[PDB]
């Protein structure tokens, strides 16, 4: 990473990675598929040229948001180095490069937020997690708890209690008894087994820890909703 | 060498100059895989997986 860009190198890297990710996962997202021209990134050493570059970047950013919704190059010229004499070369380069860079990064970040909210339904994913994984359907949770405690107290083995037929029957009954059990957000819930116990240990509080509720995240949401996040939720 | 095309033959001569003594049939198949626009990193991972089990 260039030393003069070190203060912006990480943001540039994140922006480029995000742009490539958005193109790979949802290339037709309105944020991802916008033909809006991206502001030019160039080194400016004239204070007038630097202000003009900043203004053009700002105009480009504004136009793109609406659509989504000198140095050493002349001879007699003297302003071309006026910033270079007023400002130090590292500071001049920083001012010249990061302003258009910051404008483009900000536009990218805004479009990414919009894409995640509208196209990736991250809020809808959180709502689904609340409905199904957070047991927002209180009736389903009550039926599940009663059936689980009946099976655990009767000493059913994981092969008997956690049998896919038994687990599916319990899930169907809990969803049918839940007002939210038939919701499409509840459909993202899946009951999986971490391990198969030979015997349900009596009076063990962790007896049902073998059960896991998994939440599926599609691209690109699986970059943000990572397998680690789903594992912690489980 | 007759297994490799002239472009594939030139790539084989380049690979030899790169120090790779590759079989012309293996190189031909590799070129065909590259012609299918498969990412070379995935092809490398595939080659590594295929080779890792074959202890010399």
């Amino acid at each position: 990473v260039p030393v003069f860009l070190k203060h912006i190198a990480h943001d540039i890297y994140v922006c480029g990675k995000t742009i490539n990710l958005l193109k790979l996962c949802c290339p037709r997202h309105y944020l991802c598929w916008s033909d809006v021209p991206v502001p030019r990134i160039s080194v400016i050493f004239s204070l007038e040229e630097l202000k003009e570059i900043e203004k053009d970047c700002a105009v480009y950013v504004g136009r793109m948001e609406r659509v989504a919704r000198p140095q050493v190059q002349s001879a007699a010229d003297e302003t071309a180095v006026q910033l270079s004499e007023l400002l130090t070369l590292p500071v001049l380069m920083k001012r010249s490069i990061t302003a258009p860079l910051a404008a483009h990064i900000s536009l990218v970040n805004k479009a990414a937020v919009d894409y995640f909210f509208v196209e990736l339904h991250l809020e809808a994913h959180y709502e689904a997690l609340r409905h199904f994984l957070l047991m927002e359907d209180g009736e389903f949770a009550q039926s599940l708890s009663d059936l689980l405690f009946e099976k655990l107290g009767a000493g059913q083995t994981p092969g008997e209690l956690l049998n896919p037929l038994v687990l599916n029957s319990v899930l169907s009954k809990a969803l049918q008894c839940s007002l939210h059990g038939d919701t499409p957000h509840a459909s993202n819930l899946s009951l999986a087994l971490k391990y198969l116990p030979e015997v349900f240990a009596p009076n063990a509080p962790d007896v049902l820890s073998c059960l896991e509720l998994r939440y599926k995240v599609d691209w690109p949401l699986n970059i943000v909703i990572t397998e680690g996040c789903l594992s912690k939720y489980s | 060498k007759k297994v490799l095309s002239t472009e594939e033959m030139e790539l084989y001569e380049l690979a030899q100059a790169a120090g790779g003594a590759i079989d012309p049939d293996v190189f031909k198949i590799l070129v065909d895989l590259l012609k299918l626009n498969v990412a070379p990193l995935a092809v490398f991972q595939m080659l590594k997986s295929m080779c890792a089990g074959q202890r010399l």
């Binding site: 896919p164 459909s187 993202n188 899946s190 009951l191 999986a192 896991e212 998994r214 599926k216 | -």
Partner: protein, 33 residues
């Protein structure tokens, strides 16, 4: 997970059956030629 495994198994079974049907008709054609 479980619903995703169910979908993968169902899709793989459908694809294998479609390939088997295509093979069956290919073999019948090669037996007719």
């Amino acid at each position: 997970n479980m619903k995703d495994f169910e979908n993968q198994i169902t899709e793989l079974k459908k694809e294998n059956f479609n390939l088997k049907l295509r093979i069956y008709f290919l073999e019948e054609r090669m037996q007719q030629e």
